[PDB]
Design a protein around this ligand. Sequence first.
Ligand SMILES: *[C@@H]1O[C@H](CO)[C@@H](O[C@@H]2O[C@H](CO)[C@@H](O[C@@H]3O[C@H](CO[C@H]4O[C@H](CO)[C@@H](O)[C@H](O[C@H]5O[C@H](CO)[C@@H](O)[C@H](O)[C@@H]5O[C@H]5O[C@H](CO)[C@@H](O)[C@H](O)[C@@H]5O)[C@@H]4O)[C@@H](O)[C@H](O[C@H]4O[C@H](CO)[C@@H](O)[C@H](O)[C@@H]4O[C@H]4O[C@H](CO)[C@@H](O)[C@H](O)[C@@H]4O)[C@@H]3O)[C@H](O)[C@H]2NC(C)=O)[C@H](O)[C@H]1NC(C)=O
Ligand SMILES: Cc1cc(OCC2=NNC(=O)CC2)c(C(C)(C)C)cc1C#N
Ligand SMILES: [Ca+2]
Ligand SMILES: [Ca+2]
Ligand code: NA
Ligand code: NA
Ligand SMILES: [Zn+2]
Length: 805
Amino acid sequence: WTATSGSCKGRCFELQEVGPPDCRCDNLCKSYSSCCHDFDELCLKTARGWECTKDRCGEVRNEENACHCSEDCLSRGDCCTNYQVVCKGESHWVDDDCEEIKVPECPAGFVRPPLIIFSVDGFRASYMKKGSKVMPNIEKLRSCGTHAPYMRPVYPTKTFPNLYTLATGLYPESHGIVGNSMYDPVFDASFHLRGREKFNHRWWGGQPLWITATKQGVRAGTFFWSVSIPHERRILTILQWLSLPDNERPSVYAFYSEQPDFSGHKYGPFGPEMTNPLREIDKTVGQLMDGLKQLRLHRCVNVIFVGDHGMEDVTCDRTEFLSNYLTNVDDITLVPGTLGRIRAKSINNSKYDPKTIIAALTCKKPDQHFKPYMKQHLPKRLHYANNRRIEDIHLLVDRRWHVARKPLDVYKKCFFQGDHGFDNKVNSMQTVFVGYGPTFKYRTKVPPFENIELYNVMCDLLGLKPAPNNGTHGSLNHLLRTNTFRPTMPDEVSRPNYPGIMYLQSEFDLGCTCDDKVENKLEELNKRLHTKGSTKERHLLYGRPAVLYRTSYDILYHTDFESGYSEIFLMPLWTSYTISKQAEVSSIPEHLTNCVRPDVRVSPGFSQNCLAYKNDKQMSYGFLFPPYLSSSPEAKYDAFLVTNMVPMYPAFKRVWAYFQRVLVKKYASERNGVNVISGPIFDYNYDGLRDTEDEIKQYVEGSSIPVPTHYYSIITSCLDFTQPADKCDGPLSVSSFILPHRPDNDESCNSSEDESKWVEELMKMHTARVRDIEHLTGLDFYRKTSRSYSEILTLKTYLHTYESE
Ligand SMILES: *[C@@H]1O[C@H](CO)[C@@H](O[C@@H]2O[C@H](CO)[C@@H](O[C@@H]3O[C@H](CO[C@H]4O[C@H](CO)[C@@H](O)[C@H](O[C@H]5O[C@H](CO)[C@@H](O)[C@H](O)[C@@H]5O[C@H]5O[C@H](CO)[C@@H](O)[C@H](O)[C@@H]5O)[C@@H]4O)[C@@H](O)[C@H](O[C@H]4O[C@H](CO)[C@@H](O)[C@H](O)[C@@H]4O[C@H]4O[C@H](CO)[C@@H](O)[C@H](O)[C@@H]4O)[C@@H]3O)[C@H](O)[C@H]2NC(C)=O)[C@H](O)[C@H]1NC(C)=O
Ligand SMILES: Cc1cc(OCC2=NNC(=O)CC2)c(C(C)(C)C)cc1C#N
Ligand SMILES: [Ca+2]
Ligand SMILES: [Ca+2]
Ligand code: NA
Ligand code: NA
Ligand SMILES: [Zn+2]
């Protein structure tokens, strides 16, 4: 209950919220039913529309007008954006030539370049090229400023998740906005696009930019714009705020457009009806820039033109129904559309079996347009598991499709031709970034990056210290003319031990066998050189990874590979090896099929044992350095060390063997050598972070040998592939993956066929950034290179997506 009897007289778009029930005059007042009685009359004037015409020039001020063409208007800060153009023969900003902004050119009293974030809903990355002919203002920003070919949104590629990620630098699983539609089982409450529930602050975690700014003495404009406030009024309001006195004036502003998303849904992404929404947005941008130029701020303000997600072709008829797969379909609740999330219709039901539901949705139709997943088995690159609002069962839907529970949901809710929300690697979901202003670079193209990185940059642009977030600060330094942040490497916490030969064969009782005994003096200096690190410059190209937590671990050198062997987990944390373009693949000889060999540098008590694997009927083993890529029969023996062994499900060994026997060599042939770092990952509580040993839920039966949830590899080579990986003078090229360590291959519907038809497809789905692997291992890679740290940070955030162009 309000008493909306107060006035908005002199308080239109006031910047501080006033507390109940003395009434309100700000964007949110609409949404709360709390506007003063005279809000529309005073604050949302429309009279005479939004453009000066020559006949209004010098007019006598009429305070009813939407905007002003009177002589006093620049001082009052309320001219129509085109005032100078119409009434003073000035040029539109877009018609001016691009001139480098080497320094901020700000009015007296401006302590810092303001930041304006101009966000556009559903603005697909390819619109920059495909609609360039009707967006001249946007094209000027893009070509004159800093731009990426695209920006990667977060999953799901929906509006609120991506807008709140822009604002916080956090993954949805961390900020809490995991969908445009959510059920929180603790609140027993649903968040939806319509309704008041979405306004409760309990949904919104993390620290958004406007709060970071306010806590550190920097004022912010509104970020939320009521849908009924027209765009012309949003721009005018931002420009009026910018004319405030120095002590009152915000330093950070946002504009938001519902277009082009709104039309895109109706007409599809490239429907002929889309040309006009693009024209309209461009004109808004023109308004803002003409407004800035009037206020002499057009070479002072940093402008970010950014999208939340793209748009794909999606029609009613491309709908998969769960009623076609399940008998029991009236027992579940589905969050439907371009993703699926399934939970039990009734919490009072231990007669709900996720496994039966998954099984009924797996590889059931040859052409099935969705794939079910327990959330912990989703590609780790999506970071979409660690929140109670994310249901245990998830459906990843194919681009261009929808999922629904029953047909009646689709005609008793055709309408739409476009939608979004698919996997964030999908080309159609990619969106836009341009930065323009004194702090951004001039006429510069940067590589595509993820939207989680922007919070840090926006904080830099405003001299703020970012709250803790999922960006890698320094990874986007290359966007900026002048950086206030100088990243440095994290310090190594645990130093390795370098053990020599300390144990006799007979001290081991590991239950292992190997056929390995066959009697030269100059090649027993040579083997000792290898165990000492003589080849380490070849196999460890970028320094040893730094261990960033307290543990006990040993560096082990070998002719063909180096490892960091954990005495706690009883297996390598990491194993590094270089495979040249010329290298040969060989088999595991017959006599060495079951060979495992005690490592005389490591105590029986810190070693795995073969008996455990014998007794564990589910669990087998693999090797991190592959025996198949041994440099010589003699070096091959090293690959069968117990210290190179790791626990693997037989089903997983199909994947791993194919990767080690076939794919490594292919990549070395295509990339002119590769360096490989492989290792285990433990993330039993699916938080994206390295587990402590007291969090492991599975061990090889009757042992202390922990079972990894995933296995990673980082495959690095020279960006200039005319140089071999091991003699690379310049920038690097990386691809990586985090493969789920699963006792079945149900994820891959063709897994009954030869590995050549499905393994690589699986691996591509589980593509990862180096940074993802860092979070999951507490390791820090690329410690010793010839490259700047900023560049290395960019490299560690790279994701190889395996999309077309
Ligand atoms: C991406 O970046 C983010 C941001 O940096 C990383 O997220 C951080 O992860 C940290 C480590 O996991 C985590 O630290 C914990 O903080 C607890 C304090 O929590 C409150 O205060 C802060 C600060 O202002 C606040 O941000 C928190 O935010 C959550 O609160 C609610 C959740 O209901 C949401 O509104 C909000 O979105 C956010 O939710 C998200 O995080 C929570 C966990 O915090 C998840 O469960 C949600 O699903 C969601 O993802 C809080 O409001 C603090 O209490 C913890 O301390 C315990 O654990 C340490 C471990 O070493 C231990 O030493 C202590 O003993 C302590 O133990 C006691 O508690 C245990 C656990 O409850 C208990 O079992 C023990 O027996 C003890 O009693 C912990 O330090 C930090 O909160 C988040 N920040 C955010 C915003 O999420 C994320 O890791 C990055 N991602 C990647 C992939 O790198
Ligand atoms: C630029 C920006 C705009 C935003 O809100 C815009 C908006 N206005 N009106 C609506 O009806 C839809 C959403 C937001 C949120 C988090 C407040 C949603 C964040 C960010 C960022 N960074
Ligand atoms: Ca959107
Ligand atoms: Ca974990
Ligand atoms: Na076994
Ligand atoms: Na399968
Ligand atoms: Zn939309």
